[PDB]
């Protein structure tokens, strides 16, 4: 009787393939970190509505990062920081402007899929990787599991909430 399997305690684990992790952000800061330690490093940070330009500290893969953050929208902003190699620097790759405070991540087809854009029109976008199987994630917030075959429902949630 459930589409939303959960919510699950924040944890570190290797998610199975073909399942959306629907992560519910409670407060500002790091929402999750994920990597395979080879070619894929991503971390999403959450900035609350109506935040003028300010400097904030975030721990990413055990590294202190100081980012300047701006949020002029009435919605929350979820910024994806990405790098593709050990010696690389992190850069902003994607932005999700959402008033539902939900992000999503899926491992499928040899790629990592997330949501970005502005709700209720957010869409999925892919990141190529040569080692999907070794990708793990530390989720800092409670989360749900939806099968990829029910991605439509996941979409709706991310775009409209509960």
């Amino acid at each position: 009787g459930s589409i939303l399997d959960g919510p699950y305690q924040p944890t570190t684990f290797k998610p199975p393939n073909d399942y959306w992790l629907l992560i519910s952000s409670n407060t500002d800061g790091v929402v999750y970190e994920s990597t395979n330690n080879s070619d894929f490093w991503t971390a999403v940070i959450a900035v609350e509505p109506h935040v003028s330009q300010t400097n904030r500290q975030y721990v990413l893969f055990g590294e202190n990062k100081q980012f300047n953050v701006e949020n002029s929208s009435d919605k929350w902003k979820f910024f994806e920081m990405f790098k593709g190699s050990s010696q690389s620097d992190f850069s902003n790759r994607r932005t999700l402007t959402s008033n539902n405070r939900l992000v999503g991540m899926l491992k499928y087809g040899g790629r990592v899929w997330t949501f970005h854009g502005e709700t209720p029109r957010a869409t999925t976008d892919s990141s190529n990787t040569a080692d999907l199987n070794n990708i793990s994630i530390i989720i800092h917030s409670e989360f749900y599991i939806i099968p990829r075959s029910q991605e439509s429902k996941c979409n709706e949630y991310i775009n409209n909430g509960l």
């Epitope: 570190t12 684990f13 290797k14 970190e33 990597t35 395979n36 330690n37 080879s38 070619d39 893969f61 055990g62 590294e63 202190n64 593709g84 190699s85 050990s86 010696q87 690389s88 620097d89 040569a130 080692d131 199987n133 070794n134 793990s136 530390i138």
Partner: single-chain antibody, 235 residues
Framework: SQPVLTQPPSASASLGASVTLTCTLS???????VDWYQQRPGKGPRFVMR????????SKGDGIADRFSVSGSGLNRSLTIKNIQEEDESDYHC?????????????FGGGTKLTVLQVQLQESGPGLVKPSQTLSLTCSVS??????????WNWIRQPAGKGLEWIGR???????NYNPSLKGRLTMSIDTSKNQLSLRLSSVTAADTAVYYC???????????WGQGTPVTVS
Amino acid sequence: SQPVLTQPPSASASLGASVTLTCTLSSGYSNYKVDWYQQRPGKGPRFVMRVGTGGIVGSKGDGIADRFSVSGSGLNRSLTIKNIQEEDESDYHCGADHGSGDNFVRVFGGGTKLTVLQVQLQESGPGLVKPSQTLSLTCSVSGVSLSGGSYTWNWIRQPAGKGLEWIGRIFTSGSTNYNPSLKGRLTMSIDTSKNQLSLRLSSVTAADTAVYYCVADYYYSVPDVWGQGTPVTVS
């Protein structure tokens, strides 16, 4: 192994003074980060600090005193020790990652001998091995489950020349990266259920005489974790 790390063989310092050990990158790698390692007398290496051109990256290692700072500019990467104690007399090693995915390699400096005026890894081996035979090493891990999936496990040897040599790394799935300098003589395995890491090196020669170390690399932290190594002497 495109980048080259240059460390002076020896450095000297007096008690209570300051000294700066340096590691110089080859041209074209000004953005690269390097790890510093401290190998105390009668011990194997331990992690010290990671530094790029913007200072320290991540946390410093366990047991590293606040007298240890770290900096970088241009191709220079520096480990500075102030108010030097005699326990600071040690060998100091420079390491750096290069590449991603299939072409990954780890390069090391020659090492600098400074003279002063949780997760546990245990490596086991034969001790003595005859040439042309196959060297079989194991390493037991006790801090974590090898089926967790958030660790990369490296093997690093210290052969003739006294500088560290990265030989390979294995991931939880069993995927591997080997050093090309070893041909295909090196196979690395992971035993999920026995929590064990295993290594085979075919057709060994005097060039393979070395101390072999297993190094845990947690996905979400900077400091390494070393076993204390297994001596291997090729007949």
